[PDB]
Design a protein around this ligand. Structure first.
Ligand SMILES: O=C(O)C1=C[C@H](O)[C@@H](OS(=O)(=O)O)[C@H](O[C@H]2[C@H](O)[C@@H](NS(=O)(=O)O)[C@@H](O)O[C@@H]2COS(=O)(=O)O)O1
Ligand SMILES: O=C(O)C1=C[C@H](O)[C@@H](OS(=O)(=O)O)[C@H](O[C@H]2[C@H](O)[C@@H](NS(=O)(=O)O)[C@@H](O)O[C@@H]2COS(=O)(=O)O)O1
Lengths: 68, 64
């Protein structure tokens, strides 16, 4: 890959839509206003980081509860 | 587990949006503290106050 310092490409090119809450170690919420996909999940069973659908069903409630 | 350590035990209350690279929201619903920031300037990760007003707006924007 192009190193970060040089890349103008939004980090998330594509999202995945079938990530279950139970397999998520954390969601990383990137501070990238200019890009459509800001949410990256780190997964528990494989430790991949996958960009996820921000409309995934469980995401909103998971985020709101973190803040209570 | 009684074994299980919550990754965040203490938080910073004075972190502003501009000094954050990203937030990590830890899937540890059991724990009081679930919010981590990687800092630009430092590159340290710190746990941050979850009642920080800007955190809400930050997360809502990410969801659109
Ligand atoms: O809607 C959810 O966030 C959710 C639904 C499911 O019961 C489960 O996810 S799964 O469909 O991927 O299996 C998960 O629910 C619970 C879950 O039992 C625990 N979280 S998890 O291990 O990461 O999956 C539990 O401690 O909290 C989840 C619900 O959130 S809560 O508000 O803290 O109770 O997620
Ligand atoms: O905008 C960002 O904050 C960011 C963008 C990159 O896509 C990401 O790459 S990475 O997650 O594979 O490393 C970058 O690096 C961070 C990342 O937030 C964290 N990884 S984690 O430990 O699983 O959460 C971070 O804590 O470590 C990475 C730093 O990379 S490094 O400088 O080359 O060592 O985050």
């Amino acid at each position: 890959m192009k190193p970060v310092s040089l890349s103008y490409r939004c980090p998330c090119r594509f999202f995945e839509s079938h990530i279950a809450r139970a397999n998520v170690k954390h969601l990383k919420i990137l501070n990238t206003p200019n890009c459509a996909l800001q949410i990256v999940a780190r997964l528990k069973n494989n430790n991949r980081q996958v960009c996820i659908d921000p409309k995934l069903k469980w995401i909103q409630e998971y985020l709101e509860k973190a803040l209570n």
